[PDB]
């Protein structure tokens, strides 16, 4: 969906130690949003395991039930090779799938 | 930077904390926050989290048990209660939930007599188990020449509907009267066949009179607490037949301002010690003994009445009210006022 | 999905985690979840099991670090009770330290080094405070070359450059680099990385920042 | 710390390890790790000093590159002749954004060194004059380190007069108090009833008249054995006349109470000025503690302590007889 | 001789925290093209 969060206030200058400002949130309808402030400085010392919506992805990709980039050697190999059970009552099904992950 | 008179403050924890007390606490007139401590704990350590008093400043996370936790006012404010707490066995924090004075807040009169009875007459309800009740009451009235007969004459009253309302409980306690200066000068003493008399200890109460420590007027708390000590003492021998079953309740008035003995702090542990007090892990004993401080002359320390003062959990023993008249109206508020008294969920001693 | 509010904590504080519940298609789900916290030895010191049940997907928790605790890189493992055997971490470094008054940030000219580069490894120094104003002080950087899984340092590639204007400048000399290993053929670095060690310091000398750029 | 026993029950396998954690009495360190540093303040032939630094590296290896964090004292400055001569000198460097400050606010040099041998010392030295004057003057110091080590460290400081510029504390066992205060309460005519309500505050606890007999001096503090001829007020000290107290003051004062031996002494203090666990109590002649000479008996006959003897005699009289008023 | 403000009126800051706004937020408001809006107020450290 989306997700932005943004000043409140009208630019202006830089806040002071110990003042109010609007924090504006233009995120998804029925939606919770958790908010979570930290200083810079935290950073500067360690800078790893930082949720971010590219690892989130990430993992999210690295779990396709398919492994070939594309194509087979031949036609049960491609449905297998891109997560798909081909079975007809001719007798044309494809390969059987063991292993949860891919192969290699 | 400062909050003025009917500001109001919110609190609210983070997430995976539970927020008990008062949310919104808004500043009265009396220079005092409305409601209860605002507190966030989330319920992991043996014992809740003693959360932090507005005013105060706590040093110590760990909530384990034996784990203590320590307290520190601002700058210019008297701590009321107990500066260390430790988490004792059972799921409960030592001594008192502290509280930052400043030198105007008092005490109005319903909030004395309110926090008085509520740690009184529990006090007394275990009292009954079970004539002369098993209970003794030390009236300890300061009369230097630092208070003046105003306040004096006005504290003698405060104690006559004091005696009166305890009467009406139907409870006939063991009273000593005892008014000090340069030197204690006993009255009533506990030994006596008339110290369960409530008449006569109220009209002892009454022959009793600002001049008779005028000659005299220093003030020395120290031999004051030190007569009383005389009086639950025993010559030994006695090792008495039913000593530790005796509850000891000591109340009395006092600037706090005393020169002379020094820090009178020193005979309480005495008292302590005779009693077998806080000397046992599994016995604390600490529901056989009380002491009540209260405020009446014009500059009063509450440094020193909560030194003496003791502190217990969810109870108040250190009180100042406003003037004279507000210190009376708490023990007329009394002597109609009829709570509840239950026991309920009580054990016996203890085949 | 574990979310940690700070990566990095120090002994006496808390740790503020929550978990996010969701199904393969990436949206709110109520299930068992346990939850476990294995120390720098990887041994569970505490283990849980909440369900996202009612909670839109949202497990808010937090684990209190004891004053004596063992320093180390922590983690907090977590996996659904209908499946142990897919297990999700996330972890969280435990030290005694303190925050800085300004970052320090090291980047080469180029994002690589060329073998037969004569000019060799030129490295800028860009320091400014946390609030966005800019370093004055001097700084202490030195190079090195790191084969697999080991560090040969190089004490001849030393510098000490003044740092100016919130910002300065340190180059690797070719020559200096070809010494540091024993082999006369340059070729045989082709595969090898190098590491640079920077050090800020102020003119008051109340702060003193430490980074590094490696690989 | 105390003997418990473990109970188990079932079948099954365990372990069980019980390790106790606490602060041991090393020491032995005497840290100061791979450094030697021994800083000195001397005169010249304002005021201007010299402040001689020697440091070396405890290892087999000449130190690398290291750092001279100085702090000058409050009031001083090093000159800025010195610190070009240190500047332009090999193996030594500092930041010209250093140099070009003037006596304005330097109070804080830092002097970058190239390499610090293992064998020798390498001592260098500059000038430090003094452009602000004021009393009580704030002890300097000096850290040195490596660059890439912080923890490992030597920080000393240094005082025109306080030894090893450290500051007055009395110290005993593991509790000390600080000692950077006046000798006593103070010195314009003390009539009787300032001596009375000045001895009634709530603050004061013990009043004695005490006759100095044994004066056991030291280098922190100085032992003032002190005798109670009488106790006009009775402190917090359960101590009955002819019993002895042990008196601690700072160095500092001891030009200031000039108290003789074989003399009586009129002195009262508050009952924060105590030292030491019971019986074993040590009074404290702290900036709030009373002292004043008593005329002994056949003194106070002389045309110049008639007034004096007369005060203090209705004094000690009002004070046992009436005792402190309200 | 003398000015700027007395050493007692001076509030001091203390609170300097690491991390903070650790709470949660429902977006109701009116959704307009299909984007709902929060304006909080919140106080920032010292
Ligand atoms: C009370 O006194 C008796 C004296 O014989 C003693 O045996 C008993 O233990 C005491 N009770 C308590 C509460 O300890
Ligand atoms: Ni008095």
Not at chain 4, 236 to 243: I, K, L, N, P, Y
Request: with cysteine.
């Amino acid at each position: 969906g989306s997700l932005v969060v943004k000043s409140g206030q009208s630019e202006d200058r830089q806040p002071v130690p110990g003042q109010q400002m609007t924090l504006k949130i233009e995120g998804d309808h029925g939606a919770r949003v958790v908010l979570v402030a930290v200083d810079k400085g935290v950073f500067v010392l360690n800078k790893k395991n930082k949720l971010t919506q590219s690892k989130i992805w990430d993992v999210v990709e690295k779990a396709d039930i398919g492994c070939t980039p594309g194509s087979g050697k031949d036609y049960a190999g491609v449905f297998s090779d891109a997560g798909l059970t081909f079975t007809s009552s001719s007798g044309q099904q494809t390969a059987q799938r063991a292993e949860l992950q891919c192969p290699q | 930077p400062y909050y003025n008179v009917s500001d109001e403050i919110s609190f609210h924890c983070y997430d995976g904390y539970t927020l008990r007390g008062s949310a919104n606490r808004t500043c009265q007139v009396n220079g005092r926050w409305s409601g209860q401590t605002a507190i966030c704990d989330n319920g992991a350590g043996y014992c809740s989290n003693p959360g932090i008093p507005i005013g105060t400043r706590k040093v110590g996370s760990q909530y384990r048990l034996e784990d203590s936790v320590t307290y520190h006012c601002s700058r210019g404010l008297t701590l009321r209660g107990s500066q260390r707490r430790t988490c004792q066995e059972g799921g409960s924090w030592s001594g008192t939930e502290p509280s930052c004075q400043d030198s105007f807040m008092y005490d109005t009169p319903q909030e004395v007599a309110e926090a008085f009875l509520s740690s009184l007459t529990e006090t007394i309800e275990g009292v009954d188990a079970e004539p002369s009740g098993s209970m003794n009451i030390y009236l300890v009235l300061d009369g230097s020449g630092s208070i003046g007969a105003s306040d004096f004459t006005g504290a003698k009253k405060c104690l006559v509907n004091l005696i009166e309302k305890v009467a009406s409980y139907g409870v006939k306690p063991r009273y000593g009267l005892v008014t000090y200066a340069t030197y204690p000068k006993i009255w009533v003493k506990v030994s006596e066949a008339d110290s369960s008399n409530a008449d006569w200890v109220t009209k002892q109460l009454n022959e009793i009179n600002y001049e008779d420590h005028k000659l005299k007027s220093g003030t020395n708390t120290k031999k004051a607490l030190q007569a009383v000590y005389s009086m639950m003492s025993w010559p030994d021998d006695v090792p008495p037949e039913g000593w530790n079953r005796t509850r000891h309740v000591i109340i009395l008035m006092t600037d706090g301002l005393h020169n002379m003995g020094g820090d009178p702090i020193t005979v309480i542990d005495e008292i302590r010690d005779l009693l077998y007090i806080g000397k046992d892990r599994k016995n604390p004993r600490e529901d056989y003994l009380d002491v009540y401080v209260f405020g009446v002359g014009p500059l009063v320390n509450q440094v020193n009445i909560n030194a003496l003062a003791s502190k217990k959990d969810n109870e108040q023993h250190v009180f100042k009210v406003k003037d004279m008249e507000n210190l009376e109206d708490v023990f007329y508020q009394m002597i109609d006022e009829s709570q509840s008294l239950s026991l309920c969920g009580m054990v016996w001693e203890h085949d | 999905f574990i979310q940690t509010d700070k990566t990095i904590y120090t002994p006496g504080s808390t740790v503020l985690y929550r978990i996010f519940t969701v199904n393969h298609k990436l949206l709110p789900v109520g299930r068992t979840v346990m939850v476990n916290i294995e120390n720098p030895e990887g041994i569970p010191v505490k283990q849980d099991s909440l369900s996202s049940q009612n909670q839109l997907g949202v497990l808010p928790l937090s684990w209190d670090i004891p004053e004596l605790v063992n320093m180390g890189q922590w983690k907090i493992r977590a996996y659904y009770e209908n499946s142990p055997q897919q297990v999700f971490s996330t972890e969280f470094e435990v030290k005694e330290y303190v925050l800085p008054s300004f970052e320090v940030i090291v980047e080469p000219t180029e994002k690589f080094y060329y073998i037969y580069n004569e000019k060799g490894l030129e490295v800028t120094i860009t320091a400014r405070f946390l609030y966005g104003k800019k370093v004055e002080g001097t700084a202490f950087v030195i190079f090195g070359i790191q084969d697999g899984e080991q560090r040969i340092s190089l004490p001849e590639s030393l510098k000490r450059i003044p740092i100016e204007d919130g910002s300065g400048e340190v180059v690797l000399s070719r020559k200096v680099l070809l010494d540091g290993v024993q082999n006369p053929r340059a070729e045989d670095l082709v595969g090898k990385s190098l590491y640079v060690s920077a050090t800020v310091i102020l003119h008051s000398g109340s702060d003193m920042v430490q980074a590094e750029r490696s690989g | 710390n105390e003997g418990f026993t473990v109970t188990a029950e079932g079948k099954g396998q365990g372990t069980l390890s019980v390790v106790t954690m606490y602060h041991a009495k090393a020491k032995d360190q005497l840290t100061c790790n791979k450094f030697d540093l021994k800083v000195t303040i001397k005169p010249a032939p304002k005021n201007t000093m010299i402040l001689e630094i020697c440091t070396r590296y405890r290892g087999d290896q000449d130190a690398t590159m290291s750092i001279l964090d100085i702090s000058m004292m409050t009031g001083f400055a090093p000159d800025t002749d010195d610190l070009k001569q240190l500047a332009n000198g090999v193996d030594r460097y500092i930041s010209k954004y250093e140099l070009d400050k003037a006596f304005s606010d330097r109070n804080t040099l830092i002097i970058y060194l190239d390499k610090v041998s293992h064998s020798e010392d390498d001592c260098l030295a500059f000038k430090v004059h003094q452009y602000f004057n004021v009393e009580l003057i704030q002890p300097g110091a000096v850290k040195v380190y490596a660059y890439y080590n912080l923890e490992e460290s030597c920080t000393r400081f240094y005082h025109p007069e306080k030894e090893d510029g450290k500051l007055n504390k009395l110290c005993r066992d593991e509790l000390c108090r600080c000692a950077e205060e006046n000798c006593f309460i103070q010195k314009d005519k003390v009539t009787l009833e300032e001596r009375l309500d000045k001895a009634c505050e709530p603050g004061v606890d013990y009043v004695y008249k005490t006759r100095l007999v044994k004066v056991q001096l030291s280098n922190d503090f100085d032992e003032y054995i002190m005798a109670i001829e009488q106790t006009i007020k009775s402190g917090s000290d359960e101590v009955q006349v002819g019993q002895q107290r042990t008196f601690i003051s700072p160095i500092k004062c001891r030009e200031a109470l000039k108290l003789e031996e074989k003399k009586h002494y009129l002195m009262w203090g508050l009952s924060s000025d105590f030292w030491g666990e019971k019986p074993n109590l040590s009074y404290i002649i702290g900036k709030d503690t009373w002292v004043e000479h008593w005329p002994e008996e056949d003194e106070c006959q002389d045309e110049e302590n008639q007034k004096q003897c007369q005060d203090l005699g209705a004094f000690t009289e009002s004070m046992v007889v009436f005792g402190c008023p309200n | 001789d003398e000015d700027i403000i007395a050493e007692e009126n001076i509030v001091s800051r203390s609170e300097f925290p690491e991390s903070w706004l650790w709470n949660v937020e429902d977006l109701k408001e009116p959704p307009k093209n299909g984007i709902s809006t929060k304006l909080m107020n919140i106080f920032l450290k010292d």
